[PDB]
Every structure is written in structure tokens, then in C-alpha cells.
Amino acid sequence: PKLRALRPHLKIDLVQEGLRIQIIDSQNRPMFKTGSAEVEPYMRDILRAIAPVLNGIPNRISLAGHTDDFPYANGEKGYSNWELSADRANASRRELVAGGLDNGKVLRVVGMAATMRLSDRGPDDAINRRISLLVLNKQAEQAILHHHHHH
Amino acid sequence: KLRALRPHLKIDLVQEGLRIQIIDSQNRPMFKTGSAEVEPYMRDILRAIAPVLNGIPNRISLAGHTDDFPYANGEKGYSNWELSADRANASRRELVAGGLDNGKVLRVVGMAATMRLSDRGPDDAINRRISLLVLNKQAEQAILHHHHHH
């Protein structure tokens, strides 16, 4: 019934590095109030809903935030998309943990700002605001583990 | 600044490029405990390397490492995850203040206490560090390709 409402927000697909779960915004429905890193009610439900499922998968997670709220012609000297994307990723992280997801599964939190946007400013830029959960392969995990021992 | 920063500033070469690490010391932290606002000394170092980094035509990834909060608990609220991300973003804002172009920043990462180098013994100061990674073109494309489906 309400799976029609999840359909334009929950984007699941298989990626080389593993299982990517994207929670994207709509024109009429955002997962976060514009400029805010506070979880919207509907966003709260989705994260607590997939948390018990993800906890059943023996693999670890990487969280990445994407946001288009603040300008990037900004110069980004104060609170920008970098802080916002990182905060929204961590906000999603806290909800997942509250949903029953073991905290030990979290491996990385990433702020992407708007560097990975798909649309320009306009009636389509809702897709630029998304949270990406990446359930990693054992090989992809080993690569990232290795990379951040170099970082 | 002969040996005022050299116990704090480490520079080494890795596969992905040039890694610039800013490490805490036992008696001189780069951030006050639990806080993500930059210390007066941190601000100086960051603005001292910002103009140099701006000269290098390569882009940068920021990463923070923290063990201020207990990872043995549930990490249900504000934890090392938020603190490491905020400290990375705080270092980021001090870099653009030092004249570094914001377009050079490619990624901000919180790693919490995952990449911890030492248990909470005598000198566990190394567990608290900010890592600047100046990426070569190969590593930059990889990270771009990776996050393009992340």
C-alpha cells in the first residue's frame, strides 16, 4: 500500500563495491528540512525500517551524504554543503543505530557536498539531495580499510 | 616553528598521493577534548599550509580521526563519528581562510576511532589526527568513480 510512497524515495541497486541504498528527496517531500540536518518523520521511518534488515547482513556500511541546499558559488567559507552533507549522513547514522543496526557495522561517514550532483538548479534538483548507504563487499571493505590506513 | 610543528606535522608519500597529517600531542591537543572548534595553534598551521596547497593543481580529501568519546558504548548520539567529521570540516574552513580554493576540496570523511593506532596507553595522542590527502589523477578518478555510485 504505502510502497508506492517508498518507491520514489528508496533506490536500491547492485554496485561493483556492493549493495547501494540511496534515500533521495522529492519535489514535494524532502527527507530533511532545507538547510537542516534534522531527520524528517518519513526519513525516520525508512531508516528504522531497513535497519533490522541491514543488521542481518554480515557486511559493514559506508554512509555518504549529498546535498544541494547551500550555494557552491559560495566559496564555502562558513557552514556549507560539506558540513550539511556530513551532518545529514551522521543523522541518518544515529537513526539506523536507533533502528537496531549494530554500531560496529558503521565503517565510514562521508560528506560529499554537491560534487556528485545529477541535475542543475531547477525543478529537477531534488535528486541532488540524497543519503547513500553502501553495504560493502569483503573486497571493497578491504580496499577502503587499506586506503584509509593511507589516509 | 623549527620544532614547534614538526612533532605535530607529518608528511609522507602514499599510492594515492601526498598525505599531510596533523597529529595531537600528549600535552598539546589540536582540538580541545570533545570539541570540534579549532585551537589557536591549529588555525596557524592550517593557514600556513593553505597557500602552498593552493599552488598544487591536485584536489584534496579530508579525514578526521578521534577517540575522545567511548566507542565501547552504542554510539547512539553525538559520537566520534560526528566529532571526526566536524573536526575535518573545521579544518576545511580554516584552509579556505588561508587562501585555499574551496573547489580543491573533494571529500570530507569521518573515520571515528576506526583507524586507531594505539590503545589508550601512555601516548595515545596519535589517535587524534587530521589527514589531508592531496590526490594524484589516478586516485582522484578512482574516488570520483567510487562515489559516483555511492
Chain B residues within an 8 Å CB radius of A113: 105, 108
Domains detected in chain B: 1-150 (3.30.1330.60)
Alpha-carbon distance B77 to B80, whole Å?
10
Q: How far is CA B93 from the centre of its chain?
A: 12
Name the grid cell of A24. Answer: 533521495
Q: How far is CA B2 from the centre of its chain?
A: 22
Chain B residues within an 8 Å CB radius of A18: none
Q: Are strands B105-110 and B60-65 parallel, antiparallel or unpaired?
A: parallel
Q: How far is CA B147 from the centre of its chain?
A: 19
Closest CA to B108 of B95, B99, B117: B95
The CA-based diameter of chain B, rounded to the nearest angstrom, is 44
Beta bridge partners of B131: B21, B63
Beta bridge partners of A39: A32
Q: Please give the single-letter amino acid code of residue A99.
A: G
Beta bridge partners of B7: none
Could you tell me the resolution of this structure in angstroms? 2.8
Name the grid cell of B30. Answer: 589540536
Alpha-carbon distance B93 to B43, whole Å?
10
Compute the radius of gyration of chain B from its Cα atoms. 15
Q: End-to-end distance of chain A based on CA atoms, in angstroms?
A: 46
Chain B residues within an 8 Å CB radius of A48: none
| CA atoms A82, A25, B112, B147: torsion sign | negative
> Least CA distance to B146: which residue of chain A?
A17
Asked if A67 and A88 touch (Cβ cutoff 8 Å), the reply is: yes
Interface of B with A (CB under 8 A): 14-16, 19, 61, 63, 74-77, 81-82, 84-86, 88-89, 92-93, 96-97, 102, 105-112, 114-115, 131, 133, 146-150
Distances (CA, A) of A149 to A33, A44, A59, B111, B115: 35, 33, 19, 10, 7
CA distance, residue B71 to nearest chain A CA (Å): 9
Alpha-carbon distance B148 to A110, whole Å?
13
Which residue in A20, A72, A94 is closest to B77 by CB distance? A94
Alpha-carbon distance A95 to A40, whole Å?
11
Which residue in B108, B112, B150 is closest to A86 by CB distance? B108
Closest CA to B83 of B65, B56, B105: B65
Q: Is A9 helix (H, G, I), strand (E, B) or coil?
A: coil
Q: Please give the single-letter amino acid code of residue B52.
A: V
Name the grid cell of A96. Answer: 539506523
Name the grid cell of A49. Answer: 525500517
